């Protein structure tokens, strides 16, 4: 398969792991010595937030730093506008991301009212920013060797 397709599949599978809160699936996408550097960027800044090193630090940063999905709620990490440049055995992927909160309304016991017809729930954006990935080649395909995350909303903890 094409190189650009494999690299974009790494980003797509990162979204599926980010929404499912699957730490085993997300850490498998990174090199054993990968480094995620979450940076705050409200106002063209680069103030550090959290820097992870290795798969082990990435796995634990999914159980924490990421609210466990509860009840009937889900997320959609909308990855938009991907830009990718390949330089032989290495490549750089740049994309924009928005995280949407999905809350499912409780279905009434007797059933939905006869008047309602559309999807019953709430969808609201929460976070936004840009992902920047640095990928190296691997016998299987591509893995993430480095990643920085610029949040354009003030992150609190």
């Amino acid at each position: 398969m094409a190189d650009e397709t494999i690299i974009l599949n790494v980003l797509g599978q990162y979204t599926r792991a980010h929404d499912r809160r699957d730490p085993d699936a997300m850490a498998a996408l990174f090199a054993p010595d990968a480094s995620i550097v979450v940076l705050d960027a409200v106002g063209g800044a680069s103030k550090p937030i959290s820097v992870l090193h290795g798969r082990d630090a990435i796995r634990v940063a999914v159980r924490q730093m990421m609210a466990p999905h509860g009840y009937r709620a889900w997320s959609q990490n909308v990855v938009n506008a991907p830009v990718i440049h390949i330089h032989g055995d290495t490549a750089r992927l740049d994309a924009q991301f928005m995280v949407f909160s999905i809350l499912a309304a409780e279905v009434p016991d007797g059933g939905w009212p006869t008047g309602t017809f559309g999807a019953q729930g709430r969808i609201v954006p929460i976070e936004a920013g840009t992902y920047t990935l640095f990928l190296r080649t691997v016998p299987d395909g591509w893995v993430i060797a480095h990643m920085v995350i610029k949040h354009r909303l003030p992150m609190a903890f």
Binding site: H87, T90, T132, F134
Partner: protein, 181 residues
């Protein structure tokens, strides 16, 4: 102490990142030389958190100009002055040379040689940088150099066998100058 290496495909972008990374954390700039066919080499050193942040700022701010970025963690502080400098202030009787095939292995092999014995690293030269067959010069006695040369060959040989190794017990003043030059 860690080492951060950055390779850019344009000189103007490299000197812009060299300023943006020095204003992003408390790091020391090691090497900022030009390599044909027009690429640049940014190497930094310091605390591991400041290096990764510098590489992080240098990675996003690089655009399509980025060619290779690597962070070498847990390096003995005595390795930093060997890069962009010399350890010739100490004693003489320089013994031992190790020539790897990449600079990332040459730094990893140099760190394992410091942990082996009290042998002093004079310098860690280079050529094509990341891809060049950068070498390391050691100064010590024959008993401690052979173990330091072996662990550096096993370090390089862990991924790709080094170009060659040497001993050189007595440095004829001709060869001694070139090693410390």
């Amino acid at each position: 102490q860690a080492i951060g290496i950055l390779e850019l495909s344009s000189i103007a972008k490299g000197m812009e990142l060299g300023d943006a990374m020095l204003k992003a954390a408390n790091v020391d700039l090691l090497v900022s030389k030009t390599i044909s066919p027009g690429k640049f080499l940014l190497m930094l050193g310091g605390d591991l958190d400041d290096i990764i942040l510098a590489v992080a700022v240098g990675m996003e701010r690089a655009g399509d100009s980025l060619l290779d970025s690597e962070v070498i963690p847990d390096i003995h502080p005595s390795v930093l002055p060997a890069i962009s400098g010399l350890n010739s202030v100490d004693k003489r009787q320089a013994v031992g040379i190790v020539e790897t095939w990449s600079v990332a292995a040459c730094i990893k092999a140099a760190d394992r040689a410091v942990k082996g014995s009290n042998v002093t690293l004079v310098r860690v030269h280079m050529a094509f940088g990341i891809g060049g067959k950068c070498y390391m010069v050691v100064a010590g006695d024959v008993s401690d150099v052979n173990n330091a040369v072996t662990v550096a060959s096993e370090s390089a040989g862990e991924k790709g066998l080094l170009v060659y190794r040497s001993v050189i017990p007595r440095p004829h003043e001709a060869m001694w100058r070139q090693m410390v030059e």
